[PDB]
Design a protein around this ligand. Structure first.
Ligand SMILES: *[C@@H]1O[C@H](CO)[C@@H](O[C@@H]2O[C@H](CO)[C@@H](O[C@@H]3O[C@H](CO)[C@@H](O)[C@H](O)[C@@H]3O)[C@H](O)[C@H]2NC(C)=O)[C@H](O)[C@H]1NC(C)=O
Lengths: 120, 113
């Protein structure tokens, strides 16, 4: 029950982007991929969540349309796929097994990736 | 609503002593299905945040049993009896508002004496 992501993506601003997080040894189609932010010198903030089985997506109102993510059921992999870059995206990011749909639990998140560093 | 309680923030603490953390805000925090949802977690330096779960803190993993908690109303509790020298980590509690809102605890972390 494991996860892997791309390494640091250090570059100048403006260019279109993607980064991937892959789940393995677990039922990847059947738990959402939720996300979190940490910029340099900052706490934690929430980006959104996407369902692997059918791509039902609930992007945070703080980010909606300023972001895009997708998922493929076959290679057990999901991705940020953003249309450009922003100085203010320069952060460590995250992926996880998600909240809700547990037969009970809200929090749920108990399977986690190694992190990735998008950086202008 | 808002960045919820840190309670406490952070102070130099000596090993093997005692601490606790309190999760609260103006929000109602207990839906009528009657569990409270407060959604604790914790994280060491070097990432991987750690299940401390919905019920005013709880868990279902091998994370050390020096961490435990409960509560009521809008105001909920997690406890750190035996503040062990390895736990130089950060404690957080999480919202409940579905697709709306985007908020977590205000950066409560260990410092040493
Ligand atoms: C099915 O739904 C019912 C109706 O809400 C659930 O009842 C709730 O049960 C919990 C105990 O697990 C009660 O928690 C206690 O709340 C008080 C404050 O009200 C607090 O002082 C205690 O520390 C404790 O947290 C809760 O009162 C109760 N109902 C409501 C409306 O709060 C029930 O748990 C659910 N059953 C199952 C099997 O899931």
């Amino acid at each position: 029950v494991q996860l892997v992501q791309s390494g640091a993506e250090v570059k100048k601003p403006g260019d279109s982007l993607k980064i991937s997080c892959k789940g393995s040894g677990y039922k990847f189609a059947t738990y959402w991929i939720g996300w979190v932010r940490q910029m340099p010198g900052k706490g934690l903030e929430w980006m959104g969540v996407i369902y692997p089985d059918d791509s039902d997506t609930r992007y945070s109102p703080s980010f909606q349309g300023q972001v895009s993510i997708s998922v493929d059921k076959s290679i057990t992999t999901a991705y940020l796929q953003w249309s450009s870059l922003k100085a203010s995206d320069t952060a460590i990011y995250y992926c996880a097994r998600c909240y809700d749909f547990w037969s009970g639990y809200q929090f749920g998140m108990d399977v986690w990736g190694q992190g990735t560093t998008v950086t202008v | 609503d808002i960045v919820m309680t840190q309670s406490p923030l952070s102070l130099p603490v000596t090993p093997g002593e005692t601490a606790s953390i309190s999760c609260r805000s103006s929000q109602s925090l207990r839906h009528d299905n009657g569990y409270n949802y407060l959604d604790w977690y914790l994280q060491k330096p070097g990432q991987s945040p750690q299940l401390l779960i919905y019920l005013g803190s709880k868990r279902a993993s091998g994370v050390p049993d020096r961490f435990s908690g409960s509560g009521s109303g809008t105001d909920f509790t997690l406890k750190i009896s035996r503040v062990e020298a390895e736990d130089v980590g950060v404690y957080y509690c999480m919202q409940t508002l579905q697709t709306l809102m985007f908020t977590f605890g205000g950066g409560t972390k260990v410092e040493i004496k």
